[PDB]
Write an enzyme that holds these catalytic residues in place. Sequence first.
Site, PDB file in Angstrom:
ATOM      1  N   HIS A 257      -2.757  13.669  28.150  1.00 14.78           N
ATOM      2  CA  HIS A 257      -1.723  13.765  29.171  1.00 14.78           C
ATOM      3  C   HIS A 257      -1.780  12.579  30.127  1.00 14.78           C
ATOM      4  CE1 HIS A 257      -0.446  18.279  29.042  1.00 14.78           C
ATOM      5  NE2 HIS A 257      -0.416  17.701  27.855  1.00 14.78           N
TER       6      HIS A 257
ATOM      7  N   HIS B 245      -4.582  18.750  17.820  1.00 13.83           N
ATOM      8  CA  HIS B 245      -4.607  20.185  17.596  1.00 13.83           C
ATOM      9  C   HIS B 245      -5.646  20.650  16.597  1.00 13.83           C
ATOM     10  CE1 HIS B 245      -0.310  20.708  19.408  1.00 13.83           C
ATOM     11  NE2 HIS B 245      -1.217  20.324  20.290  1.00 13.83           N
TER      12      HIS B 245
ATOM     13  N   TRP C  35      -5.228  26.752  16.778  1.00 16.64           N
ATOM     14  CA  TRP C  35      -4.871  26.105  15.522  1.00 16.64           C
ATOM     15  C   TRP C  35      -5.858  26.182  14.372  1.00 16.64           C
ATOM     16  CZ3 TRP C  35      -4.698  23.484  20.275  1.00 16.64           C
ATOM     17  CH2 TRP C  35      -3.425  23.435  20.876  1.00 16.64           C
TER      18      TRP C  35
END
EC number: 1.11.1.21
Lengths: 717, 717
Positions: free
Chosen positions: A85, A247, A298
Site C-alpha cells: 500500500h 495473496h 487464500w
Amino acid sequence: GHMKYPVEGGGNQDWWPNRLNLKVLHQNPAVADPMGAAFDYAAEVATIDVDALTRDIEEVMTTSQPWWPADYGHYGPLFIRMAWHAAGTYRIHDGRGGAGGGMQRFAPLNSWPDNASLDKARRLLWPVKKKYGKKLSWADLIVFAGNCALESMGFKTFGFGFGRVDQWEPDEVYWGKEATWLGDERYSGKRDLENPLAAVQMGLIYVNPEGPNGNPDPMAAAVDIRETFRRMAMNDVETAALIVGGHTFGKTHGAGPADLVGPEPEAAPLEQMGLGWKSSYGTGTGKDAITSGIEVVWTNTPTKWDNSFLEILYGYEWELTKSPAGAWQYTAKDGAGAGTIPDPFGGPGRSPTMLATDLSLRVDPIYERITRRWLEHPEELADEFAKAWYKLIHRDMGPVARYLGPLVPKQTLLWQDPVPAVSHDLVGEAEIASLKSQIRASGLTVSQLVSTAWAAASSFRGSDKRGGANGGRIRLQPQVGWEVNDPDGDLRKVIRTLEEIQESFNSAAPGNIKVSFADLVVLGGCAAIEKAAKAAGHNITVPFTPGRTDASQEQTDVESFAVLEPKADGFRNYLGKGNPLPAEYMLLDKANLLTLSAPEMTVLVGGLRVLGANYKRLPLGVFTEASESLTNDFFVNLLDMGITWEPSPADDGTYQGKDGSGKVKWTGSRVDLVFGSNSELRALVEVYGADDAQPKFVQDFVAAWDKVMNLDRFDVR
Amino acid sequence: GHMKYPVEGGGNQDWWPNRLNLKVLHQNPAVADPMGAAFDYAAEVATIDVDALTRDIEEVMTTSQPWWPADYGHYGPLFIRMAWHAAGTYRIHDGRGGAGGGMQRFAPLNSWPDNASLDKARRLLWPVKKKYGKKLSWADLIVFAGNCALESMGFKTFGFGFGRVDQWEPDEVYWGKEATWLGDERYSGKRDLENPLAAVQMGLIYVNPEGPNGNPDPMAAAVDIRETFRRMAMNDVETAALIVGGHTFGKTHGAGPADLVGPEPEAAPLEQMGLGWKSSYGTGTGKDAITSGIEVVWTNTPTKWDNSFLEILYGYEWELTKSPAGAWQYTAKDGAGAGTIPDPFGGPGRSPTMLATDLSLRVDPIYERITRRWLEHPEELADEFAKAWYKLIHRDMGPVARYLGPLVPKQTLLWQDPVPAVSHDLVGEAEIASLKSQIRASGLTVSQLVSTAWAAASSFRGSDKRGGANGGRIRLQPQVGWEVNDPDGDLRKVIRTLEEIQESFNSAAPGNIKVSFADLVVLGGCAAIEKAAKAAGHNITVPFTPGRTDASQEQTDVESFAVLEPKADGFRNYLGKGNPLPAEYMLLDKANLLTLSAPEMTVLVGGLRVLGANYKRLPLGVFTEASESLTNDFFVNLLDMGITWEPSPADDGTYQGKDGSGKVKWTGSRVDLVFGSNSELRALVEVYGADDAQPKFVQDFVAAWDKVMNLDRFDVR
Ligand code: HEM
Ligand code: HEM
C-alpha cells in the site's frame, strides 16, 4: 458557514475559494524539519548494519503484541500489505504517490479506508525506528519490513535500496474530487478514468475487491485491475505476478459488522495515541479483527511461500457467498476442501476462499493464460514476482545513483531510464571555456540554445524524480517529437550542430577527455545566457557541471516516457489541450514539479521571455525592445501603469496592452498577466523591476537556471 | 464534486475541518523570500536620503494621474487614510494587525470593504518604490507617505522611524467568524464585543460610519468608537484627536450607486493588474468616484491644516440626510453655510456635511469636553494629534531600538514600555560563570529558576513585539500578580532571593561592572538548566546575553500590560477559563506568538515538563522518574505502547496512563497527549524519543531556550 481561526483552518482561501495557492511552491519548509541543515540521510543510511537490522525486524515479526495479536504468530503478511500500500499510491501521469516519502504515516493516506489497520502495522515497527534512529527513515523502514517479511517466509527478493528521506509535512496531492470516502465521480465515456487518478474510487489503492461498484463480476473486475495497474506502471504479467505473489501470504479480516469500527486515525480521540478504527466487536482485534470486512484466507500456507494460491485457484470451482460482515467473496462449491485452511489463532479449520478480484486472474482471457503457465511452471512466477515487486517498491526512487546499501543489484533495468556510466575523463575548466566559445560560434541563436536546454532539462519532475537533461534523450523518441519542443523547423538543426561540435571536439580532445551530447545541450544554454548577459552589460559566468551521459534509443522506453510530455509549460508560454485548470494553475503545478520556489519561478519566466524561449517564438510576454539580451524588462514593463490591458478581441488566453495613442504595444497570456495581477506574485515582480534590481535579477535567474539544469544530477550529490 | 487540486483549493483541512493547522508555525517561509538570507534591511535604510525621499513623495502627491484623478490636485489626504488604515487594524488582545508588515498590500486586507480605493492609492507610490528599491520597504513607505502628506499640508509631526521589513506571504489572522463582508456575529448582551476583535463588523476598521448597524445615532456610535479605539490602544483624548486630525483633510466618496462598483481586488479580472472596485458610474473615477458611498467634505480647506473641522462641527446645527448612494450623513440645518465648501474638481460650493461618527465627538459627554476645549485651544489639538498619530503609526514597532533613521525623536514615551539605558559595564565571561555558581548554590530549585525565567521571557508576543524579559518587569505589578506566574507561592521567594544576589554581587565588586535584576532572572534560568543537564551526564553551558536593565513600576503602564497576560500556556500546562479553543489550539497560538517552529515547540514542551516548570508543579505530562534532570524521558514514555491512555473519570480534562497491571503510571492533559496523537507532532516526538537523540534533545532544547530568552533583545541585534 463560519470563518475559523488560522490555527483551526485558516483564511484567504475561504474568501476566494479558487484563489491560486502559492503554498504549492514551498512544500516541506526547512522550518518544519527537525534535523539540522547539515543533515544528510544518505550519509546516515550508508552506515547502517543491514544484517542486524534484518534480525531486529525478524524479531518484531514473530513477537505478537496484545493490542493487536499476530495472525498465525507472524506480522509478516501484514507488513507485505503495508509495503504494497505504501508504494501502491503511485500514478504514472504526474508521478506522485508512492513510498519515496513515507506519506503513509501522514494524512490523508494514514486514514484511507484501504489502509485500515496499517496504523497498528506501523506502530508495531516503532521498536526498530527507536533503535536505529536517524540511520533509518520510516519511508525506508515501512518498505524494507515488507521486503524482509517476504524473505523470512521463503521468498528470495531481487534486492533492495535505501535512500528514501523522511518528510515532516504531508504532500498535498489531488486524489480526486469526491468528498465522500469510497466515492466515485471519476469516469466518463466508456469506462474512462480521469487523469491523473489511478484508483477506481476515493480511498482505494487500486480497485474494489468486491468487483466494480461492488458487483462481484470477476470478468469486469479485470478491466479495472488492468487499467489501474497500467497507470501504476505494471503490464499484464507484472500485475498478475504481484497479485499472486501477495495473496500467497496472510488473510483478510471481517469477523464482525463493519459499523462496530470507530473513526479513522485522523478523526479519533487523543487517548488512542494516533490509532484509528477502534472496534467494539468482541475483543476488537486478533480473532475478531475487522479491516476490510472480507474474511478470506487464500492459501493453506498463510506464512509460507509456495504455489498454493494457484493450485487452489484452479483446484476448485467457486460460488458467491458473504462474510460475517456481509461482503462478497467466493468459496469452493460442494463443501469441497472443507477444513483445509488453518485459522489465525484458534483453529476450527476452514474451507477455501477467494476475492472476486482473485478470480479475475482465471476468468480473464489474458490473465488466465499467464497464471495457467505458472500453474504448470511455478519457477516462472517466482521470477516475475521478484522483478515486479522490486519495481513496485523502487519506482519513485529516481536515478539509480540514489539506491544506497549492500543489497542493491548491479543489473540494469529499462524502466529505470538507464544512462551509460562515465567512461572517460570529464571536461575541465579549460575545456568548458573552449566549448562555450565553440558553441557561441556555431551559428545557433540565443533563443535556440536556451530553448533546447530548457526543453531538455525541464522534462524532470520531483515527484518520482524521472526525466531531466542526463541521458541526452532530447534527441531520441518521443522527446524529439513533442509539440512543446516542436521540431517543425529548428530542434533538429540544433541537435545536428551540437553533435558536430561533439564529434570535432572528441577527436581533437586532449588526453582521454571526451564530452557527451547530453552535457553539450546544457552547456549550450549556459553559453547563450552568458552572451545575452553581456549584451545587457553584465559580465557573468553561468555555472556548469559535467557528467551527463548519452543513452541510446534502445535504453529508452518510448511508452514509459509518454507521461513526461508537457501538456503545458508556462515557462515557454505553451498551452496544449485538455488540462484540468486554467494556464496559471498549470504554471504553479509545473513550478511545483521542477521543485522551484515562487521567486525562482518568477525570475525564470521573465528571463526566458526576453531570451526568446517562447514556444514558436510567439510575442506573448516578450515585453522588451532588446534581443539576445538578458534584462529585467519583463518586470519593468509589467508594472507600467501606462499600458492598459484588455482581453484580445478573438480567443482568450491572449490580451492586449495598449498605451496612450491607443496603439497595441504588448500582447500577453494568462501566464504573463497573472504576475501583474496576483497580489503575491506582483510583490516579487516589484522586486526585480526596481531601478536597482537588474544585477540581482541576473544573479537569481542564473542561479535558478542552474538549479533546473541540475535537477536530475543525483550522480554528483 | 467538492475536493480541489492543491494548486487551487487545498488539502487535508477538507476531510478533517477542525484539523489542528501546524502551518501557523511556518509563517513567512524563508524559501518564499526573494531577498536572500543575507539581506539586512537595516543596513539598507541607513543608506536612504530621507530629504530626497520626501521631495519625491511630495511630487507624487501633487501630480495627478489620469487613471485616478487627484481631489483638489493633492493625493495627500488619500495617503493619510491609506496610512491610518495600514495601522488601524491593530488589536490589543493579541497585538496582531498594524502597519508593521505592510499587510495592507496582501489579502485579505487589500480587499476589505473599508480599504476600497487604497488599491489605487498604493499603486500611485510605485514610482517611489521603483526608485529607492531595496532601501525602502512598502511597509515603511505606505505609512511614511501618510506622514509626508500631513507635513506637506501644514501639520508638523512628532517624527517618524523606519525599520518595518516587508513580508512575502499574508499573515493569517482571525478577524471574525463572519463569512459575509460587513456581517455581524460578534456582539453579546449589552454591546459586549467578542475578543480579540477591534472592529464592529467584518471588513471594517473600527466602527460603522453610519452608526451602529447602520443606525445614525451619534450617542450610540460614540459607544462603539470609544470601545474599538480602546482595543487599539487609544484613549478618549487620543481617539478624539485622531478623528479630528484626520477629517481635517480630504473627503469621502459616494457619487453614485454602489451596485455600479465592480468586484474587489482579490476577486477582479487579470487585466485589472491588481486593482479592484472598477466602477461603471460616469468615469468611475475622480469626479464620479465611489468609495464608502458617503458624500462628505468636512472642512473648507481639504488640503490644509487649520481648526475648521471643529469650527464647523460646532458652528452649525445638524440634520440627517442621504448621500447619492443612499448613505446616512449630516448637513447643516436652515441650509446654512451654502456653497461654503470647495469641490474636488472645480464644481460649485457644497454645504457643510458630517458623518454620524463625527457628530459623536460633539454629542458624547466625554468627547464633547475634549473637543469643545480644542475649539478655543487648537494648539492642544495639534499637540495631542501629533502624539497620537505617532503612536498609531509605530504601535507595533516593539523596543525603540528598532526605530531607524534621522527622524526619530529621543523623547521617552510610556506606551513603549521604556527600559533604562545600560549605565554600567556588563558582566563578563568570568563574572557570568561566578554568577551562575552563586545562583546554583543559592538554594533555589531548578523548577524555580527555570520556571520563573520562562514566566518572564514568555511574556513576549511577536505580533506587536511587546513583552519579554528585558525590564525585569517580572517583579513589577502587572506580571507579579498574573495567576499563571502563580503569585501565591515561590515567585516572591525567588524574586527576593535573586535581588539578594544582585546586591551581594553589586555591593562588593567595583570595576564599574554591575549586573541588573532582569539579567539574573534569565541567567538563573540558564544556570538551572546547566545543573539539570549535568544531573543527567551532560556537562553543557547554556548561552547568556547580558544587557537587560531594570524598569520601574512608574515606567510600567499596568493596564497596557494587562493584554499581555496569558489565559493559557501549554508550555507550563496552564489552562485558564475563557479560551476560544481547546488547549491544543491555544498551545499552537502561543508558540506562534513566541515565533517558534514545530520542532522548537516540541523540544520545548518535553523539556520544561521534565524540569518541573509546570504550573503548580503538576504531574501532567511529567513523564519521568528522574527528579530535575534534562532527559528525553518525556518523548520516550509518550511513545510507550505499554501504556493505555483513557480520559480521567473526573471529567477534568486530564487523562490516565495505566501500565500492564492496570495501575496508573502517568497522567496528562490534552496538551501532553496531543504530541502522541497528532500525526505530524508524533513524528517530531519519534525523533527526540529514539535511542540516539539524547545529545540532540539537549542541544536543541538549549537552542530554543536561548531563543525565547532573547526574543525581545533587539538592543543587541
Ligand atoms: C487487485 C488488487 C488487490 C486487491 C483488490 C486486494 C485486496 C485485498 C484485501 C481486501 C485484503 C484484506 C485486507 C484486510 O481485511 O485485512 C488484502 C490483503 C493482503 N493483500 Fe491484497 N489486494 C490486491 C493486490 C495485492 C498485491 C499486488 C499484493 C502484493 C504485495 C497484495 C498483498 C496482500 C497481503 C500480503 C495481504 C495480507 C494482509 C494481512 O495478512 O494482514 N495485495 N488484499
Ligand atoms: C471614528 C473613526 C472613523 C470613521 C468611522 C471614519 C470614516 C471615514 C469614511 C467613511 C471616510 C470616507 C472614505 C471614502 O469614501 O473615500 C473617511 C475618510 C478619511 N478619513 Fe476617516 N474615519 C475615522 C477615523 C479617522 C482617523 C482617526 C483618521 C486620521 C488618522 C482619519 C482620516 C481620514 C482621511 C484622511 C480621509 C480621506 C481620504 C481621502 O480624502 O480620500 N479617519 N473616514
